[PDB]
Design a protein around this motif. Structure first.
Motif, PDB file in Angstrom:
ATOM      1  N   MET C  25      65.140  21.229  -7.418  1.00  0.00           N
ATOM      2  CA  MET C  25      65.408  22.497  -6.773  1.00  0.00           C
ATOM      3  C   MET C  25      65.522  22.301  -5.268  1.00  0.00           C
ATOM      4  O   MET C  25      64.967  21.359  -4.696  1.00  0.00           O
ATOM      5  N   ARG C  27      65.512  24.838  -1.579  1.00  0.00           N
ATOM      6  CA  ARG C  27      64.988  26.131  -1.185  1.00  0.00           C
ATOM      7  C   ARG C  27      65.493  26.483   0.196  1.00  0.00           C
ATOM      8  O   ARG C  27      65.243  25.754   1.146  1.00  0.00           O
ATOM      9  N   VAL C  45      65.744  29.935  -4.254  1.00  0.00           N
ATOM     10  CA  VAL C  45      65.601  28.621  -4.880  1.00  0.00           C
ATOM     11  C   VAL C  45      66.791  28.393  -5.825  1.00  0.00           C
ATOM     12  O   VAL C  45      67.213  29.310  -6.517  1.00  0.00           O
ATOM     13  N   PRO C  47      69.365  24.910  -7.762  1.00  0.00           N
ATOM     14  CA  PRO C  47      69.483  23.466  -7.979  1.00  0.00           C
ATOM     15  C   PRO C  47      70.739  22.793  -7.428  1.00  0.00           C
ATOM     16  O   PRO C  47      70.692  21.580  -7.237  1.00  0.00           O
ATOM     17  N   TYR C  49      73.920  24.643  -5.411  1.00  0.00           N
ATOM     18  CA  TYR C  49      74.580  25.182  -4.234  1.00  0.00           C
ATOM     19  C   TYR C  49      74.175  26.624  -4.018  1.00  0.00           C
ATOM     20  O   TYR C  49      73.828  27.337  -4.962  1.00  0.00           O
ATOM     21  N   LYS C  51      75.505  30.047  -1.838  1.00  0.00           N
ATOM     22  CA  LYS C  51      76.433  30.822  -1.017  1.00  0.00           C
ATOM     23  C   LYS C  51      75.827  32.200  -0.791  1.00  0.00           C
ATOM     24  O   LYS C  51      75.604  32.946  -1.742  1.00  0.00           O
ATOM     25  N   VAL C  52      75.567  32.545   0.462  1.00  0.00           N
ATOM     26  CA  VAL C  52      74.842  33.774   0.766  1.00  0.00           C
ATOM     27  C   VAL C  52      75.612  34.636   1.739  1.00  0.00           C
ATOM     28  O   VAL C  52      76.106  34.138   2.740  1.00  0.00           O
ATOM     29  N   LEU C 137      75.685  28.579   3.806  1.00  0.00           N
ATOM     30  CA  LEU C 137      76.116  27.683   2.754  1.00  0.00           C
ATOM     31  C   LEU C 137      75.194  26.479   2.725  1.00  0.00           C
ATOM     32  O   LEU C 137      74.911  25.890   3.758  1.00  0.00           O
ATOM     33  N   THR C 139      74.628  22.999   0.058  1.00  0.00           N
ATOM     34  CA  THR C 139      75.012  22.267  -1.138  1.00  0.00           C
ATOM     35  C   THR C 139      74.158  21.005  -1.319  1.00  0.00           C
ATOM     36  O   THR C 139      73.698  20.405  -0.347  1.00  0.00           O
ATOM     37  N   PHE C 145      79.807  17.426  -8.106  1.00  0.00           N
ATOM     38  CA  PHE C 145      80.966  18.296  -7.972  1.00  0.00           C
ATOM     39  C   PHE C 145      82.217  17.642  -8.555  1.00  0.00           C
ATOM     40  O   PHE C 145      83.288  18.247  -8.587  1.00  0.00           O
ATOM     41  N   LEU C 154      78.151  24.076 -12.362  1.00  0.00           N
ATOM     42  CA  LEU C 154      78.456  25.502 -12.311  1.00  0.00           C
ATOM     43  C   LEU C 154      77.562  26.313 -13.243  1.00  0.00           C
ATOM     44  O   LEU C 154      77.028  27.358 -12.858  1.00  0.00           O
ATOM     45  N   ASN C 156      74.643  25.472 -14.647  1.00  0.00           N
ATOM     46  CA  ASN C 156      73.209  25.299 -14.424  1.00  0.00           C
ATOM     47  C   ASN C 156      72.705  25.866 -13.108  1.00  0.00           C
ATOM     48  O   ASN C 156      71.498  25.968 -12.895  1.00  0.00           O
ATOM     49  N   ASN C 157      73.626  26.228 -12.222  1.00  0.00           N
ATOM     50  CA  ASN C 157      73.236  26.729 -10.911  1.00  0.00           C
ATOM     51  C   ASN C 157      72.815  28.196 -10.917  1.00  0.00           C
ATOM     52  O   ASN C 157      73.593  29.086 -10.572  1.00  0.00           O
ATOM     53  N   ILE C 158      71.570  28.442 -11.305  1.00  0.00           N
ATOM     54  CA  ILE C 158      71.019  29.786 -11.276  1.00  0.00           C
ATOM     55  C   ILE C 158      70.240  29.959  -9.993  1.00  0.00           C
ATOM     56  O   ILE C 158      69.190  29.343  -9.810  1.00  0.00           O
TER      57      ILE C 158
END
Lengths: 203, 203, 203
Positions: C25, C27, C45, C47, C49, C51-52, C137, C139, C145, C154, C156-158
């Motif tokens: 993870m 953070r 948190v 694992p 990437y 994007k906020v 951003l 990553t 990738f 893609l 698994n990225n929760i």
């Protein structure tokens, strides 16, 4: 000679098979059970993949406000060898120290923990304690993730969430039945399924 | 000899062409029209792709609270052969039975249903009934979805949504004009566009 | 002969190295500082990437309601040559005219603007004016990738976001320390870090 019957058989088969077409919808619902006897459902429809994080706030009825647990209902042409659920802490971590946490924990809920509710559906009950959040992953069964296709899969995957409140389990149950999704009642019985039967439960 | 004019011409051309650069922004706005005469706009800016699901709650003004319809305004270097809108039911489904629903319905809104509002813009009006939700897809015109690039496209695609309330169509219209986005007024006229003109509407 | 010490050394090294495993993870926390002396943290948190986009509404304490600025704390095996922050306008644009805006502005915050807070952590302070939004951003450092892997990345990225309110900087600081994340106090000092030390700050 009974083409009326044959047509009805193909309609039933069509309903049961249509979810396996490449652009079919899948449906995952998280039913939260509250001490009050009320429920809240997080109902997602999506064509390719579903990544869900329910935070502690969303899980509150709005702690006797916090769910005793959830029924996770998976429906459609879902990759059953990868479908999974886990209860994380309030930060969404599967280790208290994030530095040793991972995308999924070593004890993630999967495999035969997901109870068969028909060919199209699996369901699992997950008890929760006041400090839990919920993660769910569901992906379409293969390959739309491969090469050129991945782009169409990414761009076409519009997840459509609805939150629904129910006063009693009866409302939850009738909802599941009319929605054609798996649900496990308070006594542990599979009371709803995605599978269409030409005669209903006539045996 | 008129370099002042030539410079102004290139500035105008620059404004009109800048959106076609690979990392340019695109802008899609969903204007919701309420019986009260008020509007709410769901305004998205994004560089690569936009997948939108507006649920029935978000569509409420906050049923005479529910929109009569939406104007969907697409702006930028958008792939016009794939741009689309559809009105789904309250669950986001295009068939009442999810088992026969798909990512998009057989009658999705696309092609010449999107009215040309300049080279950079298309707009469509979609009437809604109380049980409708709205889906929109817009992708950058090709290929950033291919091979190695897809990863950069995925990681760089930060969609920036804003919700904006307007008391009257006049506010909506002035907003569209100053925002340089397509909008169709109540009489069916294209009253705003993304296209820059060196003299404005001087003909 | 001191295996108790050696074991403790490996535990410390394990904590410091575990974040570099492929499914570890990461953070990222955005600490917002309010004129009132209160703070709000947007704690993510994830694992793979992040994007906020923080809109002006989310940034309000709930204008003396608007943050004076944010501390952005990046933690984990993050690609430091691509980690970035920028303050955009209220629409999330880095040019007032969207037609000349891009995914990132020409002056984006990156490189040595991110202050080293240990091997695992970087932090940057970004002053804000009432009309600002925030983009971030982050990553995972490479390649997940590439090719076939992208699909697993893609799916698994929760991203697991939490919003946390603090009455005073002391609460913010103790939080950062117990969370093992970088934080810069009001005097400019690095008061928290992700790095584990076998003796703490014993020098």
């Amino acid at each position: 000679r009974d083409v009326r019957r044959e047509q009805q058989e193909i309609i039933t088969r069509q309903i049961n098979t249509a979810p396996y077409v490449q652009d079919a919808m899948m449906r995952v619902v998280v039913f939260a059970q509250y001490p009050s006897g009320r429920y809240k459902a997080f109902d997602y429809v999506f064509p390719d993949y579903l990544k869900v994080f329910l935070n502690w706030r969303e899980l509150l009825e709005d702690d006797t406000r916090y769910p005793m647990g959830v029924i996770v209902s998976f429906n459609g042409n879902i990759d059953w060898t990868r479908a999974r659920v886990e209860a994380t802490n309030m930060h969404g971590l599967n280790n208290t120290d994030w530095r040793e946490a991972r995308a999924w924990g070593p004890h993630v809920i999967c495999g035969n923990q997901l109870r068969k509710a028909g060919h199209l559906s699996r369901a699992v009950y997950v008890p929760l304690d006041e400090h839990n959040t919920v993660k769910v992953l569901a992906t379409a069964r293969q390959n739309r993730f491969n090469g050129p296709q991945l782009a169409q899969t990414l761009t076409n995957n519009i997840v459509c969430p609805n939150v629904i409140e129910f006063n009693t389990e009866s409302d939850v149950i009738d909802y599941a039945k009319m929605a054609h999704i798996a649900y496990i009642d308070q006594a542990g019985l599979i009371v709803a399924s995605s599978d269409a039967y030409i005669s209903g439960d006539s045996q």
